[PDB]
Design a protein around this ligand. Structure first.
Ligand SMILES: CCOc1ccnc(CCNC(=S)Nc2ccc(Cl)cn2)c1F
Lengths: 535, 402
């Protein structure tokens, strides 16, 4: 079962040499075992056998399947090749076919010729209480895969060209063939293909010995016209361990994409303070009620369809809460191709709108991979909202063709600072300062209306104070307020209308800001002669 | 023949990932490459080659034809420098650019360097492994290419350089810049003339941009707020013009008056202001283009399709500054605008210093990388980083000569 395809030229990483590790003694039952098995590989097509030349010993232990090797060293010293599998084909990107067959090309590695000037660098050793090398791609070797694929890739080119309506997909030691030919028509080409791969040493299984739909995928159950979320159910446990929860919460998270509604906030709770992975944790009632309610959900599986080039792509989104979004792409309403959820945190600043934007951006690229197209978007945001937002934002932002959808809750702007001072509205001259080293400071205000205030702050920083000043101002002030400040940092923050932060304090302010009728914020240079900021 | 080329010592071939592409672009690319394969300009490669460079496709302006584009930024960064600039075009009245990418295909590439030019045509949904190739000729968008073709280029142009030592021609990458003072009439003809002279083997206005002044507000009646804002801008300004005075003003601002409060200007203050207006009438002194150091490009989004930029090698010592008003078509697309922008600016630096500046773009990496290619149109790709527009710098440049 050898192949007459020209080997690819393999080199050892420059400046390095073939292995020299030692072979470790073995039972006599394992000696006489590898002995009479190698004898096989030899007459066949695999091994050769050598002597004192090419002293590149490579470990050769044996374990039974209740011969084998280890090139760890070799591998280390072998060059690098190209990206074997920059990512796996996700179901939503497939089109329905009339018939699908998969050909397991098992020992295809060993069917491919190795680079002769390289075989050298492969050596054996079998102590009799007997030294070989390789001539074909060996199980475990760095380049076997990348090479075998490539080989396969060429071998298929003609056929693929001659039978264009036939879609072959290569994955590991497997071939995925689909088509829109009536049955017998398909079977025939399958053998044509199969006998083609055999006209090259790569032997495959007879239709009598082949795999049958549906097929299991990235958790999917695949049929020629429909895919189904391989139903899943959590275990009923009497004693829950740390690791257990971790794994559950993990498996639970995966699911939430397909079955949005799944929750784990109360399980994640169980992990707080864990002393050891093997620890056993009690189950909050809230914790049980979640498990049960989650299991109800994970009951009725999910049915789906494939991608019809003919129809356009639609992606719609909803905000499951603050910063957590749910999306579903499809062509025929309710005929979902894909569904998903994202739930991101942040830094000193963010707002639903921009977050919505980021979701969109993700979906796009995700789509571009799956369909090489970006879907039309159905966004729970008013055009005016979007409009007034982006045209004013400091950063460059955009959204491909999208269209509003009144599917509350809608993402809106929780507030908007005035563009000019509010006439007849108090004017606070906030200012904050604290001694860097000693976390302790003060921060107060003084209005044109002669109102005043200042609080001492035990344990704080500068910005915490500045922001605080501003917070104060906001607290006691009224629906209309003018606030001058010299905080470079504070300016930006607020400026950018954030509606969610990591800082409780910032959040504090955000609430306040939301609460007021009209708020104008002004910045002025620090420590100059500028009044208010002077007194 | 082909001259031996090498990477700078120690360095190794780029191994940059292929960003996913749209079908539309892929089909186009596949088509393009297959043709180019037949012609022997490129050739499929194997896995023993572990290098990679990004590629994509862009339809040229006033063209409905798909153009293949490769990002050799990394690679160029790594190829040995080859040691092989006109101040004319800088001053010229009009300039037009010529794409001679083709020139390069004619010439072969050292066989030992070829490996490095490995690039990859991706497949959708990862359905098929990618299509890998490497050049056999001198590739377009490579810094080594214009270099190795330099020689031939000269002679090719000589008969025009001689026939017209009144016109200027600077080459940069796949680009050929030519500028004369003749009216567009006698101009386009000489360009189109030259153009033919090239086909044989096989507008712009530099005199209108340089730097602008910082116009300052001017109102009938000033309020506390007004004064403050003003003072703010100046103070910052002083960083460029240390002569800027802001005392007289900062006095008026003494007390805790409502922002809306109106305030009359001290005659003393009026002078102060007056003096600053005077200063700000011209770019500060002592600004020299150093060629040993890198050229920088900062861009601020001003809103309303408005964009402001400054080119500098050192902070507060800009060499040039400008504005850019979006082009009717980006009615709603920030990324489109920014790209166009970035483009002009690079183009200008080329004219001026014939050297690409590094950008500081006010935009998320994510955003920029999902779509920039979709609006790009140039044989070259400048360097760039992403930032958070400091609120000050904007309110300042928003104050440009309108
Ligand atoms: C387990 C699915 O196998 C494959 C995976 C990836 N690609 C192919 C070939 C492409 N076939 C196409 S367009 N669609 C398609 C539809 C249903 C099923 Cl069950 C398999 N393939 C496959 F056959």
């Amino acid at each position: 079962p050898i192949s007459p395809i020209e080997t690819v030229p393999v080199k050892l990483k420059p400046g390095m040499d073939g292995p020299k590790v030692k072979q470790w003694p073995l039972t006599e039952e394992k000696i006489k075992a590898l002995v009479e098995i190698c004898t096989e590989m030899e007459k066949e097509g695999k091994i050769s056998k050598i002597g004192p030349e090419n002293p590149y010993n490579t470990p050769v232990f044996a374990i039974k399947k209740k011969k084998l090797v280890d090139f760890r060293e070799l591998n280390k010293r072998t060059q690098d090749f190209w990206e074997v599998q920059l990512g796996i084909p996700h179901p939503a990107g497939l089109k329905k076919k009339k018939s699908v067959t998969v050909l397991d090309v098992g020992d295809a590695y060993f069917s491919v010729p190795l680079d002769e000037d390289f075989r050298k660098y492969t050596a054996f050793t079998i102590p009799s209480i007997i030294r070989y090398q390789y001539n074909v791609l060996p199980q475990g070797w760095k380049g076997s895969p990348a090479i075998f694929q490539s080989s396969m890739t060429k071998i298929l080119e003609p056929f693929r060209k001659q039978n264009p309506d036939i879609v072959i997909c290569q994955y590991m030691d497997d071939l995925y063939v689909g088509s829109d030919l009536e049955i017998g028509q398909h079977r025939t080409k399958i053998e044509e293909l199969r006998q083609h791969l055999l006209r090259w040493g790569l032997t495959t299984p007879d239709k009598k010995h082949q795999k049958e739909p549906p097929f299991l995928w990235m958790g999917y159950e695949l049929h020629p016209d429909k895919w189904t979320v391989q139903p899943i159910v959590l275990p009923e446990k009497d004693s829950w361990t740390v690791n257990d929860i971790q794994k559950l919460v993990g498996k639970l998270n995966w699911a939430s994409q397909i079955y949005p509604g799944i929750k784990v906030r109360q399980l994640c709770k169980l992990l707080r303070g864990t002393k050891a992975l093997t620890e056993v944790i009690p189950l909050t009632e809230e914790a049980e009620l979640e498990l049960a309610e989650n299991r109800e959900i994970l009951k009725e599986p999910v049915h789906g369809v494939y991608y019809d080039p003919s129809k356009d792509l639609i992606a719609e989104i909803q905000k499951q809460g603050q910063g957590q979004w749910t999306y579903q792409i499809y062509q025929e309403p309710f005929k979902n191709l894909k569904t998903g959820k994202y739930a991101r945190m942040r830094g000193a600043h963010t707002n639903d709108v921009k977050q919505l934007t980021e979701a969109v951006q993700k979906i796009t690229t995700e789509s571009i991979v799956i369909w090489g197209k970006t879907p039309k978007f159905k966004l729970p945001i008013q055009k005016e909202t979007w409009e007034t937002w982006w045209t004013e934002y400091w950063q460059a932002t955009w959204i491909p063709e999208w269209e509003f959808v009144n599917t509350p809750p809608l993402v809106k702007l929780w507030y908007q600072l005035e563009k000019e001072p509010i006439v007849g509205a108090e004017t606070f001259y906030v200012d904050g300062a604290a001694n860097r080293e000693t976390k302790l400071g003060k921060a107060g205000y003084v209005t044109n209306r002669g109102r005043q205030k200042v609080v001492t702050l035990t344990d704080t920083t500068n910005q915490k104070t500045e922001l605080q000043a501003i917070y104060l101002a906001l607290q006691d002030s009224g629906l209309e307020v003018n606030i001058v400040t010299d905080s470079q940092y504070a300016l930006g923050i607020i400026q950018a209308q954030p509606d969610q932060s990591e800082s409780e304090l910032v959040n504090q302010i955000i609430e306040q800001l939301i609460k007021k009728e009209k708020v104008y914020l002004a910045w002025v240079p620090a420590h100059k002669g500028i009044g208010g900021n002077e007194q | 023949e082909t001259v031996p080329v090498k990477l700078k010592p120690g360095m190794d071939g780029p191994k940059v990932k292929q960003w996913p592409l749209t079908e539309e672009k892929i089909k186009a690319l596949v088509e393009i490459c297959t043709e180019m394969e037949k012609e022997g300009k490129i050739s499929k490669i194997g896995p023993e080659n572990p290098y990679n460079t990004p590629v994509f496709a862009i339809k040229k302006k006033d063209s409905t034809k798909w153009r293949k584009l490769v990002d050799f930024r990394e690679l160029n960064k790594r190829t040995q420098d080859f040691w092989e600039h006109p101040a004319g075009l800088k001053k010229k009245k009009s300039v037009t650019v010529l794409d001679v990418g083709d020139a390069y295909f004619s010439v072969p590439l050292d066989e030992d360097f070829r490996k490095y030019t490995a690039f990859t045509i991706p497949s959708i949904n990862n359905e098929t492994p990618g299509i890998r190739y490497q050049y056999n000729v001198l590739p377009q968008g490579w810094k080594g290419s214009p270099a190795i073709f330099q020689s031939s280029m000269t002679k090719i142009l000589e008969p025009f350089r001689k026939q017209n030592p009144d016109i200027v021609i600077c080459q940069y990458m796949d680009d050929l810049y030519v500028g004369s003072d003749l009216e567009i009439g006698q101009h386009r003809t000489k360009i189109e003339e030259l153009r033919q002279h090239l086909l044989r083997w096989g507008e712009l206005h530099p005199d209108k941009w340089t730097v602008q002044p910082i116009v300052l507000p001017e109102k009938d009646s000033w309020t506390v707020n007004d004064i403050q804002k003003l003072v703010g801008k100046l103070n910052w300004a002083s960083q460029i013009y240390p002569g800027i005075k802001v005392r007289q003003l900062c006095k008026l601002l003494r007390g805790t008056k409502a922002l809306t409060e109106v305030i009359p200007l001290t005659e003393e203050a009026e002078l102060e202001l007056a003096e600053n207006r005077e200063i700000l009438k011209e770019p500060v002194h002592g600004v020299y283009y150093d060629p040993s150091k890198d050229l920088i490009a900062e861009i601020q989004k001003q809103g309303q399709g408005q964009w402001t930029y400054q080119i500098y090698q050192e902070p507060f010592k800009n060499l040039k500054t400008g504005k850019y008003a979006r082009m009717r078509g980006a009615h709603t697309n920030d990324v489109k605008q920014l790209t166009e922008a970035v483009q002009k600016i690079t183009t200008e630096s080329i004219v001026i210093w014939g050297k690409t500046p590094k950008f500081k773009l006010p935009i998320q990496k994510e955003t920029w990388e999902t779509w920039w290619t979709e609006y790009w149109q140039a044989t070259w790709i400048p360097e760039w980083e992403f930032v958070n527009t400091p609120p000050l710098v904007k309110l300042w440049y928003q104050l440009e000569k309108e």
